[PDB]
Each structure stands twice: as C-alpha cells, then as structure tokens.
Amino acid sequence: MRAVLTWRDKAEHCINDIAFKPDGTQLILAAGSRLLVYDTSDGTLLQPLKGHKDTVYCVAYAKDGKRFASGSADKSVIIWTSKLEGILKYTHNDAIQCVSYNPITHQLASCSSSDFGLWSPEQKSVSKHKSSSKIICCSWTNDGQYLALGMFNGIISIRNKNGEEKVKIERPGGSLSPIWSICWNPSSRWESFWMNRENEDAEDVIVNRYIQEDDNLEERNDILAVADWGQKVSFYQLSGKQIGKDRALNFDPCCISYFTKGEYILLGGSDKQVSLFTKDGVRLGTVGEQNSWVWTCQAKPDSNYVVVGCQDGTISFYQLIFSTVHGLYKDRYAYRDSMTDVIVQHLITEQKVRIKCKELVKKIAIYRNRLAIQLPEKILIYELYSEDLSDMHYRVKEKIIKKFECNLLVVCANHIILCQEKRLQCLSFSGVKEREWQMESLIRYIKVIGGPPGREGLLVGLKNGQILKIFVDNLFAIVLLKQATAVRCLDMSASRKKLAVVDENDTCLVYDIDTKELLFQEPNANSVAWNTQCEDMLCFSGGGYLNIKASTFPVHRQKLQGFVVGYNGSKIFCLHVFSISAVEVPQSAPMYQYLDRKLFKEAYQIACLGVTDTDWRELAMEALEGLDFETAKKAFIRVQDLRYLEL
Amino acid sequence: RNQERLAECYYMLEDYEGLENLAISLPENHKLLPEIAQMFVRVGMCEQAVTAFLKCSQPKAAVDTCVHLNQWNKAVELAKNHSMKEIGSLLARYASHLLEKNKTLDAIELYRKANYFFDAAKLMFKIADEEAKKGSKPLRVKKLYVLSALLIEQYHEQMKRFTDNAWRGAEAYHFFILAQRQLYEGCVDTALKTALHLKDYEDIIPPVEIYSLLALCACASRAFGTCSKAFIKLKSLETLSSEQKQQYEDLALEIFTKHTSKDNRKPELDSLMEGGEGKLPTCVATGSPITEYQFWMCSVCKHGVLAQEISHYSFCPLCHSPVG
Amino acid sequence: PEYCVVFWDTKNNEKYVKYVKGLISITTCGDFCILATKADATFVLVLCNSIGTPLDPKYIDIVPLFVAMTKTHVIAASKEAFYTWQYRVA
Amino acid sequence: MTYRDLDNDLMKYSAIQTLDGEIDLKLLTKVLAPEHEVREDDVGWDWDHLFTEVSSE
C-alpha cells in the first residue's frame, strides 16, 4: 500500500464538508463562511462563491451534475447550478448540519437541530419534518428509497422517501456515543445509473428565487457503515440487524466513506490521519497523516484518488497506488486479490483457487507444491496435498506467528528464505533459523533456481552489480559474475547454462554461466524470461513492446503494455495492470530464422511446439533438399506424406 | 537403452535419484559421464559429481568441484595427487581474503574444514586471549578456550609449546568460575583453595582478577596473612596507578588494623604450589588436590576427578564431554 | 466479453480456439487471415495463420469498415479513406 | 515503594561486600561476575553447537 500527495492547499478557515462533480473535474469545499471551487488536477482555486452570511457547515452535489446544495449557520440552504449561480434559496428552522441528494430522483434532504426538509426538483414546497434529536448526519440507501439519519443521541433511524420513520437502532450507551457520520455501501446495480450523460448545455436564470415553507426489509440488500464517538465502527442492514461485531478504534472517528467500487473504506478522525479499511472493517493502511483533526475524507469519482479536509484548514489531494503482489514458479500464477486474498491460477488447466486471509497480504512466493504468504504479523506456509501436477487443494502446512522486516521473500521445499536489507536468512518451516548469509552490497533481486529438496540453489543480484549463486545447504556464496551496473531483474535458461540480466539502465544483457562471458545485449528491457522448455529462446518487455529473441538471431517485436512474468512452450505469461494475459508466440517466424541458416535440426525444435502443415511441409522439403534425411523424415511424418517418405 | 537422452529427461524431470542410478550404471570412461557430472555441478551436488568424475577417470575435475562447492575436506582428502599440496596454498589465500574481510570465525571454520586443526586452534586461542584481556563474561571465555583445546586434541589426533598444554586456558577460566560459584555458595574455604590454585595462570588471567578474588576469599575465610600475600602481589603490579596501589593498601591496612595481617585460619595448599615436591592433580569438580591413590580421569581432556564427586555429573565439569 | 474465434482445421479435424476482444471483421487469402479489431481512434489488423497464432498486429488510425485481402496486401477502408499494408512471413 | 522496599537492591549483596559488620570489601567485588552468569549446569557440549553458540553472542 502506497499513497502520494498530488497537490495541497490551505483555506483561510476550517473545512467542514466536501463535494465532487460526478465526472471528477471540480471539487467544492465548505470552508468557513464561503464555498471554494477547486480543480482536482492541480488544486487551482477558481472562485470563492459568496452567497451565505455565516458558517457553511456542509455541501453535497446531485448525481446529474447540474445542481449542488450548501447549508449554513445563517439557517439558509442554497441550490447552485453548475453555472455557479444560486437559483433557489431556502431558509430552514435553525442551523444546517449535513445535506444529501438522493441517488435516483434528485430529491434533496437538509438536516438541522430538530427538522429535515425534503423536496423533489422545482416543486413549490418542502417537507420540514420533525426529529427527536440533533440530526448530525444523513445518507440515502443505494436504490434511493430510504434516508437514514444518525443522531447525537447515539441512535440511527431509517426514514422512507416520504419522511415516515420505519426502523431504529440504539448504540448501547445512547448519547455517550454520538453518530458523527454514516454511509450506505455503493456496491449495487444502481451505481451506473447517471453514469451515461453527454448533455452539452445547462439551465440559466435572471436572479436567485426563494422556495416557500416498505415491507420485507430483511430481503433488502443494503449495508450501512456507522462511525460513533464511543470509538467503534460497525456495519448494519436496513432490518436493524448488526453485521458481525464492532470494529473497535482508539480515536473519535469522522466521515466513514467509500470509493465508487464499494470495496474499500476511508476513515478520518481525531487520529489526525486517513486510515484505509476493507468493507469488513479490517485495517489495510494509511493515506497521508495530518497536523490536525480530520473532518472529511472523500474518494474521487471513478478513480483511486482521495481528498481530505482538516481542522487547521488544510486540503490534501492524494493518489493511492495499490502495488502488484504475485509469484509464478513454472505454471502457477499466485497473486493478490482485494488486498486480503491470494488467487492461485493453474495456467495450463486455467483452474483458480481463492485462499482468504483475515489481514493485508504483503508478500507471496510459490514453488513446486509450496506456497508462502506474508501478512502484517504472521507468515503462512501452504501445501498441495497430492503429487498430481494438476492439483489445487492447498492446505495450511504451518503458520509462523512472528513479525518480519523484509525487502524480498522466496520459498523452497522445506524452508522460507527472507531477504533483509543486506542479509539473507534461511528459516525452517516452524520458524527456527537454519543459516544466514551477509552480502558485500544491498540485495536488488532474488530467484529460486531449483535443486534437490533441501539443497536448492538461489540466484541473487546486488546493487554493486555482483551476481551470486547460494545453496541453502551451504555457508558460502558462489560468485557467478560481476557487472558495471545494478541487477534490476534476473533469470536462468532451462539447462542452467545461461543467464539473462536487466542492468538498471533499461537494457537486457545475456551471459554464459559456465564460462562467465557475455553472449549478447538488447537496448530496451524492463522484465525478461527464458522459455521454460525450449532453450536458446527468451522473451522481454520494454518501452511498450513485447520482444521474442531466438539464439542470437533478430528479435520479433510487437506492441504490448504489461510485463513478462514467465514463458512456457508457445505461450508468454505477460501480466497486464491487474491480471495475467497469456500471449502466444508466432512459432513459424523463429522456425524460418533457423532455416535461413540451414539449421534444420534446430528448426524442427521450434516447429515441434506447434506450427501449420504449411510450415511443416516447408521445413520438410528444406531438410530434404539440404540432405538432412533424419529431419525431413520427421518433418514429413507430421504431414504424413508417403510420397516423399518412399523417396 | 538410450542413456544419452535418458539423462536429459531425468534432469528436466528433476529426478536426481534417476540421474544417479543412470550414471552409476555406466562403464568407466563412458562418453556420457562428464556431462552427467556437469549436471550434478549445475544443481550443487558434490558427492554425485565426485562419483561421476571418478567413474570418468577425470580426477582434476573432482578436486575442482570440491573447491567450487567449498567441500575443502573432500578437496584435500583425494591424497593420490600432488595438486592436494597446491590447493593447500589456494585454501591459505582464500582464508587470507576472509581475514581481509575480517571474518575470523569463518577462517576458523574453513581451517577446521581443511583439517588445519593447529591453525584453527591458534586462531581460537587468539580470540580466547583477546576476550580474556577485554574482561569478557568468564563462562564465554571458558567456552572459547575449550573450543581451542578440542582443536589441539584434533591436531594431536591427526598425528596418528602451545602445541603441548592444550587445556591451560580452559582450566584457568573453569577454576576462576568455580571459585566465584564457591563464594556465592558460601563455601568460602573451597573458593579460597580454588583461588590459590589460580596463582599458576597469571599468563592467561590478569593478576588483578586472581589476587582480588583470592584476597576476598582469604578475608572472608579470616586468612588475613594469605590476604596480605594477595595484597602484596596486587600492589607490586606495574600496570597500576599510585592511586590504585594506595586504594588497595587502604583496604589491606583496614583489614590489618580491624583484625590482623596474619592467618587466623590457615590454608596449606602452598605445600604443593612451591613445586619442589611436585603437585597432586587439582580436581575439576572441586578445585582441591586429589589425595586418592587412583581415581577417574576424563577420556577427552584427561583431567582427574575424585571417585565420589564424579558421580554427581553426566558431563565433564571442565570440557562438558559426556563422562567416560 | 470476447468473441470466441474458432480455427477449425478441417484437414486434420481439430479446433484451435482464440478469444478476441472487439472483433470487427474476418478476411482470408491463402494460408493467412486477418481478424480486424477495435484496440483497447486506433484499430488493429491481427494478421494470423491457419491454426490461429497471431503473426503481426498492425495498428491503424482509421476504422476498418471495408477490408480486402490479397497474397501480398491488406486493404482497409473507412467511408472516406483507405490504407494499404504489404505483408509476408520471414 | 518505602525505604525498606528500595533497600532490597542492597540487602543480599551486603553479605559478600562486608565482613563481621566491621570491614567493607567493595573495591575487590568489582572483579566478580554476577551469580546468574557464574552458575554452571551438568549439560553437555559438542563442537559445532558450541562454536555456533559462541559465534551467535
């Protein structure tokens, strides 16, 4: 988990609530006694909108993107066009608290100390309906049919679109635990409703006017996030039933909030940060920490950006980066899903299995029959129960309840290998350390290169450019090579005779390991793999291309974005920004590159992975005319042409 | 019967038991043995590669493989060749490079793998000497001299004045710990006998610790003349400041004026420690001379123990080897 | 969301199956076919062999509404302009 | 904590520091390693382990 400050500003005053245009282009902020309009790209403040007299305690903005509502200590509410003019003023019983537009009908609500004021667009009247208590925070059900209200009295209550009250829940303790914000989860069919508009014009008006004066709930699917000043968060159904248990805190929370996706939660407060959570209320990380109390944390529409507002008047705009976590071995891509699950995919059979953790997943590693997963406070070892190469029945083998610091992680037959920042540790399953190795420079890359169970070779690349082989049953590290620049990435060919290296200047270099000599290099690479079966052939990605190279011949280049994770038979396991894509090789092309050189015996090895009967016949008659009768015999047996077999 | 691709299959299949039973089936000097030997090298298996380079009658590559996989014992144990002496110079150069990296414990382990047990003992003694002179934890310093003494015994085993006195530093720290144990046990007259026996070990334990502990046990015993001996020995030390000499004199004169500078109760172990009549062996279980005519002796360190006191132990009180 | 493109080798009787996003047209000439597609404006002419392994995905900045194929050429045309690409295997 | 509760830091060690209530030896006692590091056990050693342990400290 990583978060980057994209831009920052500070108002003259405290910042009370936040609104986004639905396309994400403009941000509106209820700062002190004016509205502020911001560009989300770089934080330029376009205009202070002037209409109110006193503290703008909130703003909210309708799903069609034409109109926004803002509420004040001066008792006013104002409806602003997206032309930034306030066409319909209104004046409530007391100071405004929170306001919220309906997802479906554009019906507005506007909360106050006793009274909440519903109206649907440009009707001539408002339902100023009464409440038992100070009405702190309000949120519409995802289908638009109920407005749920949280009270300073520690009650949440649920009102229909007409204003009748249908359900109540009390937090045990009542006014001990004020409800300072609540939010219905966005995760239902209606989120794409209003996601299709291309209207090119807007409404316009001379001067600003005034506006005068439910069964089978257990089958309704919606879920409500409750943040209370008893310092607990919990989730609730429209039936009033609590989901699971209270996710405890050590702060006064505010503005419990979700991304457009409904799967990740933002949580601000008197912890003076924006904490990030799963939809189950498990913690996942920390968006930027703050000088003062956080009142507001609003996720941007359609995207992973976040914006925050604090008691000191700071506005901060963050991008969340959500890095990729995975490992492949030969043909089993294991990767992070949500941030709590591993999905393990058998790439030949296309089977998937889900393993669910109960925390963040930080590191994954995989090897024949062994999977390993690191969480914040334990490391899990998983085992395939059968020697069958098609098996997917992972069981937890062992669970090491110990915390670790690491740069890289790998797993072998009987061991976990931990890279600390200049040091390599071998740990048994069951956590007892076996051996350790100290490098002459910072470790940049590691791969397991196979071996007998318990003597496995590790291949290691250092920042000084040294490359090492280390045997897990040995106390000494074996120099393979040294290079003029750091190892960015590293792989060995199918026989273990050859090495490919990425040099941290975006080039691929290729070496003989048995003689320690450079064979060739390529000027644009970011990740590289040897073909797992067909030696003398490799693939890399870089600069928006995929690049397949055979045996010192020219390289096949085609457009791709994403990275090579592995290469088997006729398929390259390229990884797109969220999922594995399995590109296929033009086997016919490298086969002709061997026939260019009359290497008939080598050309058959590219053909034999899968080519057309045209390719087989062309190979067969080139071998026949080359007087390579042992190749031609086999190249024609594939076509089964008895005429030339008789010859 | 396609051994030449059956090897390629057992390697790609990762069956090193298959590839072993393939290479063990071939004739000597058979054309496939040097490639199966290289497969075992690429995967890190020394005994299988050594077996293959011996069936190929190709012995220089076996030695070089033992060097490459750091099996320096097996590298030098191929005693049929002159190259064994030559690689002893490479082993020395590799150890010198570990010592330029200051990895003295790895150079000790490498010399132990080389069967250079004298040079491993010498380096372990160098650590035991420095760690003694730092005033390190006494039991850690016992362990360090025991590690050296066991390497001197392994060099003596390899034959089948640091060369001739293997256990001396282990005895010194053992009796120095035992005197302090006997003091904490309130057995101060046994602590006194053990601290008197430490007079012999001034080359290993600095005289300050010896004569401080002896003066303390002698004073607690009311042997204030033996305490006076220890104080005279302390004040003589040329490494002390005039301040420290005076502080020891102040304490000696405090004891002498409050009681006496003579023994109110007398130790008699000096009857051996004058050396002319020879010495009885000091028991490693008790720090007192063995008066028994014949008695138990440790098969490892060859120190004696009283036949009653040895019954209290599973492991030798000096060397921690099992009793026998 | 993909088109299930099937290359049915009728000479040996085998199916090779290729899931393709945004398929606009198929065309053939000799041993090669073109799956013309919408790129994830740019469009891509996925030149492909008789068992369905892609050979050279050429990106073009015109809509391939009309396509003609020839033993040396692909021609693709919008309502207003046409692009000619000459091709071979090596 | 009372004065007596603090004095437990000194109460036991006084019997090694002092003789007959007349003499104080503290200058000599600076040489002593503490009892829990001076105590020894009837437990065996082996060279690989003993080296590993002495190397791990």
The kind and range of the H/E element at B233 are helix B224-235
Short-list A73, A82, A97, CA closest to A17 = A97
Interchain CB distance below 8 Å, D19 and B220: yes
Residues forming beta bridges with residue A353, ordered by sequence position: A344
Separation of alpha carbons A592 and A595, rounded Å: 5
Residue C20, chain A, CB below 8 Å: the answer is no
Tell me how far the alpha carbon of residue C90 is from its chain's centroid.
18
How far apart are the two ends of chain B, measured CA to CA in Å?
57
- Please tell me which residue of chain B has the smallest CA distance to D57: B140
CA distance A96 to A128: 13
- Per-residue burial over A312-347, b if 16 or more Cβ lie within 10 Å, else e, is ebbbbbbbbebeebbbbbebbbbbbbbbbebbbbbb
Residues of C in contact with A587 (CB under 8 A): 53
Measured between beta carbons, the chain D residues lying within 8 angstroms of B216 are 25, 28-29, 31
Answer whether D28 touches B (CB < 8 Å): yes
CA neighbor of B206 nearest in space, from B309, B130, B261: B130
According to DSSP, the residues that pair with A471 across neighbouring strands are A457
Q: Which chains does C contact via 3+ CB–CB distances below 8 A?
A: A
By DSSP bridging, strand A332-337 and strand A341-346 are antiparallel
In angstroms, the CA B292 to CA B283 distance is 11
The position carrying tokens 């048994």 is A428
User: What does residue A354 show for φ and ψ, rounded to 5 degrees?
Assistant: -105, 125
Which of A409-422 are b and which e, b meaning 16 or more Cβ less than 10 Å from the residue's Cβ?
A: bbbbbebbbbbeee
Contacts of B150 in chain D (CB under 8 A): 47
Which residue blocks in A270-394 are alpha helix, DSSP H?
none
Which has the closest alpha carbon to A469: A498, A497, A493, A446? A446
Alpha-carbon distance of B288 to B282, in angstroms, equals: 5
DSSP B57: T
Q: Are A458 and A447 contacting, i.e. CB atoms less than 8 angstroms apart? A: yes
Chain B CB within 8 Å of residue A455 CB = yes
The Cα of C68 is separated from the nearest Cα of chain A by a number of Å equal to: 23
Helix B168-184 with B207-220: angle, nearest 10 deg: 30
Our CA-based measurement puts residue B8 at a distance from the nearest CA of chain A, in whole angstroms, of 9
Q: Report helix, strand or coil for A396.
A: strand
Contact D25 B209 (CB under 8 A): no
DSSP A615: H
Report whether B265 contacts B223 (CB < 8 A). Answer: yes
Measured between alpha carbons, how far is residue A458 from residues A221, A264, A426, A428 in Å? 51, 37, 11, 16
What values do phi and psi take at A645, rounded to 5? -65, -40
Chains C and B touch (3+ CB pairs under 8 A): no
Query: Contact A475/B43, CB-based, under 8 Å?
Result: no
Query: Beta A341-346 vs A352-356: how paired, if at all?
Result: antiparallel
What is the spatial distance between Cα A286 and Cα A268, in angstroms, rounded to a whole number?
A: 10
A322 Cβ contact list (under 8 Å, min separation 6): A1, A2, A304, A339
Nearest to A267 by CA among A295, A246, A290: A295
Find chain B residues with C-beta within 8 A of A450's C-beta: 14, 43
Q: Is the dihedral of CA B186, B189, B190, B196 positive or negative?
A: positive
Phi, psi (degrees; rounded to nearest 5) at B2: -115, 60
Tell whether A627 lies on the interface with B, counting CB pairs under 8 A.
no
Q: Which residues contact B116 (CB under 8 A, 6 or more apart)?
A: B91
Q: How far is CA B132 from CA B120, B139, B170, D40, in A?
A: 18, 10, 11, 18
What residues contact residue A285 under an 8 Å CB cut-off, 6+ apart? A1, A3, A275, A276, A360
d(CA B107, CA A531): 41
CA distance B210 to A331: 69
Angle at A505 between CA A504 and CA A508, to 5 degrees: 80
Question: Is residue A485 within 8 Å of residue A504, measured between CB atoms?
Answer: yes
C90–A contact, CB cutoff 8 A? yes
How distant is the Cα of C49 from the closest Cα of chain A, in angstroms?
A: 8
In chain B, the largest separation of any two C-alpha atoms, in whole Å, equals 100
A452 and B12: CB-CB below 8 Å? Answer: no
Percent helix / strand / coil, chain D, rounded to 5: 55, 5, 40
The closest alpha carbon to A572, from A610, A539, A609, belongs to A539
Q: Is A457 on the interface with B (CB under 8 A)?
A: yes
Strand order, beta sheet including A379-384: A363-367, A370-374, A379-384, A394-400
DSSP code of A221? -
- For residue B5, count other CB atoms closer than 10 A to its CB: 8
Judged by a CB distance cut-off of 8 A, whether residue C31 touches chain A is: yes
For residue B323 the two structure tokens come to 């009793």
Backbone angles phi, psi at B163, to 5 degrees: -60, -20
Backbone angles phi, psi at B200, to 5 degrees: -70, -15
Q: Which of B126, B141, B211 is nearest to B172 (CA)?
A: B141
Q: Alpha-carbon distance D6 to B211, whole Å?
A: 33
Are the CB atoms for B36 and B45 separated by under 8 Å? Answer: no
Euclidean distance between CA atoms B42 and B34, whole angstroms: 12
Q: How far apart are CA C58 and CA A347, in angstroms?
A: 28
Q: Rounded distance, CA A25 to CA A14, Å?
A: 23
Mutate to test the interface with D, among B178, B212, B234, B316 (most CBs of D within 10 A): B212
Q: Is the CB of A497 inside 8 Å of chain B's CB atoms?
A: yes
- Cβ atoms of residues B246 and B281 within 8 Å: no
Please say whether the beta carbons of A351 and A553 come within 8 A.
no
CA-nearest of A70, A69, A110 to A93 is A110
DSSP class of residue B161 equals: -
**Angular region, B261: left φ>0, alpha ψ -120 to 50, beta rest:** alpha
**CA of A506 vs chain C CAs: smallest distance (Å):** 25
CB contact under 8 A, D25 and B219: yes
**Cα separation of A418 and A429, whole Å?**
12
Residue numbers in A near B68 (CB within 8 A): 478
Contact D43 B320 (CB under 8 A): yes
Question: Which residue from C50, C56, C59 is facing A612, i.e. has the nearest CB?
Answer: C50
Experimental method: cryo-EM
What is the β-pairing status of strands A332-337 and A583-584? unpaired
Chains with ≥3 Cβ pairs under 8 A against D? B
Contact B109 A471 (CB under 8 A): no
In this structure, the dihedral spanned by the alpha carbons of residues B160, B164, B170 and B173, taken in order and rounded to 10 degrees, is 180
Radius of gyration of chain A (CA): 32
Return the number of other C-beta atoms located less than 10 Å from residue A205's C-beta: 12
Chain C residues within 8 A of A562 when measuring between CB atoms: none
Chain C residue with the nearest C-alpha to that of A571:
C53
List of chain C residues whose C-beta atoms are within 8 Å of the C-beta of residue A613 = 11-12, 50
Question: Best of C53, C58, C87, C88 to disrupt the A interface by mutation (most A CBs within 10 Å)?
Answer: C53
Report the C-alpha gap between C70 and C27 in whole angstroms. Answer: 10
A333 SS3 class: strand
Instruction: Name the 3-class secondary structure at B18.
Output: helix
The answer to whether A465 touches A487, Cβ cutoff 8 Å, is yes
8 Å CB contact of B44 and A471 = yes
**Chain B contacts of A473, Cβ < 8 Å?**
44
End-to-end CA distance of chain A: 67
Whether B139 and chain D come into contact, CB under 8 Å, resolves to yes
What's the rounded Cα separation, in Å, for the pair A36 and A50?
Answer: 9
B125 DSSP 8-state letter: H
Task: Give me the residue label for tokens 């097996």.
Answer: B74
How far, in Å, are A333, A368, A646, B10 from residue B14 at the CA level? 21, 11, 40, 6
Quote the DSSP letter at residue A452.
S
Q: Which two tokens stand for residue A152?
A: 């300073």
Best interface-test mutation with B: which of A440, A455, A513 has the largest number of B CBs within 10 A? A455
C49 lies within 8 A of chain A by CB: yes
What residues 611-630 of chain A have any CB closer than 8 A to a CB of chain C?
Answer: 611-614
d(CA B105, CA A475): 12
Question: Do residues A94 and A112 lie in contact, with contact meaning Cβ atoms separated by under 8 Å?
Answer: yes
Chains B and A touch (3+ CB pairs under 8 A): yes
B42 touches chain A (CB under 8 A): yes
Give the nearest chain B residue to A497 (CA atoms).
Answer: B42
The length of chain D is: 57
Q: Are A265 and A281 in contact (CB under 8 A)?
A: yes
Q: Chain A closest CA to B316's CA: distance in Å?
A: 29
DSSP letters, C22-89, are SEEEEEEETTEEEEEEE----EEEEEEETT--EEEEEEESS---EEEE-SSEEEEE-SS-EEEEE---
Other Cβ atoms within 10 Å of B243 Cβ, number: 8
3-state SS, residue B107: helix
The answer to whether residue B135 neighbours chain A at the CB level (below 8 Å) is no
Alpha-carbon distance values, A643 to A418, A632, A637, A639, C12 (Å): 62, 12, 11, 11, 18
Instruction: Say how many C-beta atoms besides its own lie within 10 A of residue A498's C-beta.
Output: 19
What span, in angstroms and rounded, lies between the C-alpha atoms of A630 and B3? 20
Strand partners, A268: A254, A274
**Angstrom distances, CA of residue B272 to CA of B214, B250, B289:** 17, 31, 9
| Burial state string for B70-109 with b = 16 or more CB within 10 A and e = fewer than 16 | bbbebbbebeeeebeeebeeebeebbeebeeeeeebbbbb
Preferred mutation among A614, A637, A640 to probe C, highest tally of C CBs within 10 A: A614
Chain-chain contact of B109 with A452 (C-beta, under 8 angstroms): no
Euclidean distance between CA atoms B126 and A435, whole angstroms: 25
| Cβ proximity of A60 and A69 under 8 Å | yes
**CA separation for the pair A17, A110 (Å, rounded):** 14
Task: List helix spans (H) across B134-199.
Answer: 138-158, 168-184, 188-197
For A382, the 3-state DSSP assignment is: strand
Q: How far apart, in Å, are the Cα atoms of A3 and each of A254, B53, B102, B172?
A: 20, 57, 43, 62
In three-state secondary structure terms, A82 is: coil
- Which helix (H) or strand (E) segment is B19 a member of? helix B16-23
Please tell me the distance from the alpha carbon of residue A278 to that of residue A360, in angstroms, as a whole number.
9
Gap between the Cα atoms of A257 and A316, Å rounded: 16
Residues 6+ apart with CB under 8 A from A352: A343, A344, A345, A346
- DSSP category for residue A428: E
Number of H helices, E strands in chain D: 5, 2
Please indicate if any CB of chain B lies within 8 Å of the CB of D9.
no
Distance CA B298, CA B310 (A): 10
Tokens for A452, please give them. Answer: 């007998």
Rounded distance, CA A255 to CA A133, Å?
20
Residue corresponding to tokens 């009274």: A115
CA atoms within 13 A on the CB side of A30: 29
For residue A343, give every residue at least 6 positions away whose Cβ sits within 8 Å of its Cβ, in sequence order, or none: A334, A335, A336, A337, A352, A353, A354
Q: Which residues contact A128 (CB under 8 A, 6 or more apart)?
A: A92, A93, A115, A116, A117, A213
Choose among A412, A288, A402: nearest CA to A5. A288
User: Residue A267 carries which side chain, given as an amino acid letter?
Assistant: L
What length is written for chain B?
A: 324
Phi, psi of D38 (to 5 degrees): -85, -30
Residue A182, both tokens = 């609540």
**A490 in Cβ contact with A447 (< 8 Å):** yes
